[PDB]
């Protein structure tokens, strides 16, 4: 189905506390597979999935890590530049710490071929500049971003992101997807169970738990005799278990005696048909 390769770059100036720190991680869908930190003593790109520590890497590209290392040092160095210029652009003082984030990558259609390219930036947490899916044109979010747009259009930088995306990005996404088949393409269904928690004489909380699933995408809902009550239910954000699987709970406070009128609804990629369940 729809798969994505994403890199996430964060640089943070630390006025007084030394030069900027660069961090980079790479993901395929919800699975991290590489990291880099410019504070590490002898800083290299490091595998962070098992399937990135298998011999296939050597044969596909014997220099894989040295290359990602090289790129990440460049990326780090450029952002040390950016943080000075953006200071300038926004006429900001020397003492404040500021943040530059880049997220770039590709999505695939279910055909296999490129669906969408991404290359987008934020400054101090807010939209700055982003490449349109024409892969020629930028959206600058403000007057400082306009300087950047004019610069990169005049210079024809979009072309380079286009060739990376059209060549490398899709190619490696497919490589990682095929090489990591058993972890990435093998979806784990959620294991759901309902728990009963008396929380007064007027309401006993019925909580629907969904656990050990991959990927993170999931819909948890409570229905009351066919009536979805998403507006009257408590539902946490999906959370990482710590073992590559995710967790989520939805809870409704019902009057005691009405337990069997509710039905928990679980929909998930790895489930054949949707789960429906209630108190024991």
């Amino acid at each position: 189905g729809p798969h994505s390769l994403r890199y996430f770059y964060t640089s943070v100036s630390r006025p007084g506390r030394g030069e900027p720190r660069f961090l980079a991680v790479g993901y395929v869908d919800d699975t991290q597979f590489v990291r880099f930190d410019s504070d590490a003593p002898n800083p290299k790109a490091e595998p962070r999935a098992p399937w990135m520590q298998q011999p296939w890497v050597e044969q596909e590209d014997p220099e894989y890590f040295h290359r990602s290392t090289r790129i990440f040092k460049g990326a780090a160095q450029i952002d040390r530049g950016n943080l000075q210029t953006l200071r300038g652009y926004y006429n900001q003082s020397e003492d404040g710490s500021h943040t530059i984030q880049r997220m770039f990558g590709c999505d695939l259609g279910p055909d296999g071929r490129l669906l969408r390219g991404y290359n987008q930036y934020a400054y101090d947490g807010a939209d700055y500049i982003a490449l349109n899916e024409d892969l020629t044109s930028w959206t600058a979010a403000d007057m400082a971003a306009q300087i950047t747009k004019r610069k990169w259009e005049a210079a024809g930088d979009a072309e380079h992101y286009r060739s990376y995306l059209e060549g490398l990005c899709v190619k490696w996404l497919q490589i990682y997807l095929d090489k990591g088949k058993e972890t990435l393409q093998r979806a784990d269904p959620p294991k759901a169970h309902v728990t009963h928690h008396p929380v007064s004489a007027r309401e006993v909380t019925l909580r629907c738990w969904a656990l050990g699933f991959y990927p993170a995408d999931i819909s948890l809902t409570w229905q009351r005799d066919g009536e979805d009550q998403t507006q009257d239910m408590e539902l946490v954000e999906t959370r990482p278990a710590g073992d590559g699987t995710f967790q989520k709970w939805a809870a409704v406070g019902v009057p005691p005696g009405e337990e069997q009128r509710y039905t928990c609804h679980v929909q998930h990629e790895g489930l054949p048909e949707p789960l429906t369940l209630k108190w024991e």
Binding site: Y64, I78, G81, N82, A155, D157, H160
Partner: peptide, 9 residues
């Protein structure tokens, strides 16, 4: 595989 931007902003 990563990619670094040609120029700064």
């Amino acid at each position: 595989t990563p990619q670094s931007a040609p120029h700064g902003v």
